[PDB]
Amino acid sequence: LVHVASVEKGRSYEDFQKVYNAIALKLREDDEYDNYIGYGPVLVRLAWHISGTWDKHDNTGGSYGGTYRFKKEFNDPSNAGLQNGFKFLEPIHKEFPWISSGDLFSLGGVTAVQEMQGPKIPWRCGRVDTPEDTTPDNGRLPDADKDAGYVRTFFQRLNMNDREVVALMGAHALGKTHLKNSGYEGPGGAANNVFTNEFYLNLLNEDWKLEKNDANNEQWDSKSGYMMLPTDYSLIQDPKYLSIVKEYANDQDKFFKDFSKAFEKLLENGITFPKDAPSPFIFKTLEEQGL
Ligand code: HEM
Numbered sequence: 001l002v003h004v005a006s007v008e009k010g011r012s013y014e015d016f017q018k019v020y021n022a023i024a025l026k027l028r029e030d031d032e033y034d035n036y037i038g039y040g041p042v043l044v045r046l047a048w049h050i051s052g053t054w055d056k057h058d059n060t061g062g063s064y065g066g067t068y069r070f071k072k073e074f075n076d077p078s079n080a081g082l083q084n085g086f087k088f089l090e091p092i093h094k095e096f097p098w099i100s101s102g103d104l105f106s107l108g109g110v111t112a113v114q115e116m117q118g119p120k121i122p123w124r125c126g127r128v129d130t131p132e133d134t135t136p137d138n139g140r141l142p143d144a145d146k147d148a149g150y151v152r153t154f155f156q157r158l159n160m161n162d163r164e165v166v167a168l169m170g171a172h173a174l175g176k177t178h179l180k181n182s183g184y185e186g187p188g189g190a191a192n193n194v195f196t197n198e199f200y201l202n203l204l205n206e207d208w209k210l211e212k213n214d215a216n217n218e219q220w221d222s223k224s225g226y227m228m229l230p231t232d233y234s235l236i237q238d239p240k241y242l243s244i245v246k247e248y249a250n251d252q253d254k255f256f257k258d259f260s261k262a263f264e265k266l267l268e269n270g271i272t273f274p275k276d277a278p279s280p281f282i283f284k285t286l287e288e289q290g291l
Contacts, residue, residue, distance in 0.1 A: 001059035005126030005273045008098050013281050016107070016125060019099055020283045021291070022092050023111040028286070030088070034175070037193050039088050040112040041175025046085035047109020047267060048171070049078070050102070053136045054269045056159050061140060062270030065130035066101025072132075078141040081181035102127030106267045113263070114285050116174070118195030119256035122264050122280035124273060144184060144229045145217065148238035151231050158269060160262065166244040167258040168266065172232055173199035183215035186227035200249035202226060203236050 008015075023043075031038045050068045053061030067073050074083070089108055093099065099107075103125055110121045142154050155165045175192055177184035189198040206222040213219055220228040235241040248255040264280070 001270075003059065003062075003064045003128075003271050005124065005271050005277055006128050007126050007278065008100060008103070011098065011125070012278070015098075016123075016281055017283055019092065019096050019104070019107060020111050021286065021289075022095060023089070023108055024115045024286045025291075026088065026092065027112065027115055033084070037175055039085065040116045040193050042082065042085040043088065043108040043112040044171055044174065046082045047106050047112075048168075049082060049141060050105045051266045051269065052142075052158065053140045054158055055140070056157060056269075059270050060134075061136040063102045063106050063267055064127045064271050065134050066103075066105065066127060067130065067132075067135040068105060069101050069129075070132045070135045072135045072138065076138040076141070078138070081178060100127050101129050109263070109267065110283070113195055114283065116193055116195045119260040120282050121260050122282055124268060124271075124277070124280050126273065126277065127271065142231065144182065144231050146231055146234075148234040148241060151234055152238075158266070160266075162240050163244055163258065164262040164265070166235060166241055166248065167255065167262045169232065169235060170197060170199045170248060170255055170259060171263075172229070173197075173202075177219075177227065177229070179213065179215055183213070183217045184219050184227070184229060185213050185215075186219075186221070186225070188226055188228060188232070190224075190226075197248050197252045197255045199232075200245050200255070203228065203232070203245060204249055208233065 027039055033039050051063040055061055073079065085108065089104060093104055107123060110123045113121055151165060152162065160168065173189050173192065173196060176187040179185040189202050191198055206224060206226060208220040208222050208228060210218055211221045218230065220233045235245050
């Protein structure tokens with residue numbers, strides 16, 4: 001399977017910066033969602049789940065085809081709760097009907113990270129919608145009740161190494177787990193709609209307790225009202241993972257730089273860009289534009 005990026009006809013940077021601005025403006029406007037967390041966290045989880053289906057062995061899945069719009073993928077039990085992110089983006093797709101679905105879902109993740117004052121994420125356009133029969137089957141996304149060996153093996157399918165996995169997991173500082181979506185409940189820290197390295201700091205400094213929640217699943221809970229998934233706590237149980245957790249807890253700029261590289265790679269896996277394709281765009285935030 002080869003997937004060649006094809007720029008939406010006649011579009012350039014200025015067109016995609018208008019779409020970025022439309023998403024950022026609605027993120028600011030619809031601030032009441034999920035007890036005032038806002039839509040930022042569910043939009044970076046949507047960009048990760050539409051990319052996270054990729055398989056390096058046969059180049060199936062991934063963000064290219066925008067197949068989350070089809071019933072099979074939209075209804076995946078692992079995607080429970082992401083309908084809220086799709087509904088947020090639906091008015092913006094009506095306003096810019098020329099953007100492909102893969103490009104809009106991946107750009108929603110980029111916009112959310114940057115507007116929640118995370119690092120700049122370079123982004124490339126050119127994903128092309130593919131037919132319903134190219135939709136990957138359910139079951140390619142990760143379980144939360146496992147250990148470090150499972151996380152390591154799982155991310156080898158997306159060819160992410162240990163460093164890329166630990167950097168990507170720092171996004172779990174954002175938003176919260178919701179009992180009715182996943183069978184887990186609670187936030188991972190106090191700043192859950194501002195992008196920071198707090199996930200690493202909490203993992204190493206909190207006093208965690210293994211408890212059972214109302215859906216009968218075990219999770220790690222702390223005196224401060226925070227929680228961590230079994231796969232999250234994995235990162236301090238493994239010696240290789242633990243030393244990179246300590247590095248990001250002690251250097252927030254290195255965490256931002258490594259996250260940016262791994263998140264762009266996640267969103268681009270499976271796509272072939274021609275050498276006459278445009279360079280990655282770096283979008284300005286609303287704040288840098290005085291908007
Ligand atoms: C082994 C890897 C991972 C597992 C098992 C996992 C699992 C989960 C689960 C169970 C939730 C809660 C869903 C809900 O109840 O609403 C969640 C939320 C979230 N995850 Fe992951 N995740 C993984 C990796 C990642 C990565 C790599 C990213 C992003 C780069 C990410 C971003 C998020 C975000 C932002 C949320 C919060 C969503 C919200 O507030 O609505 N996750 N994760």
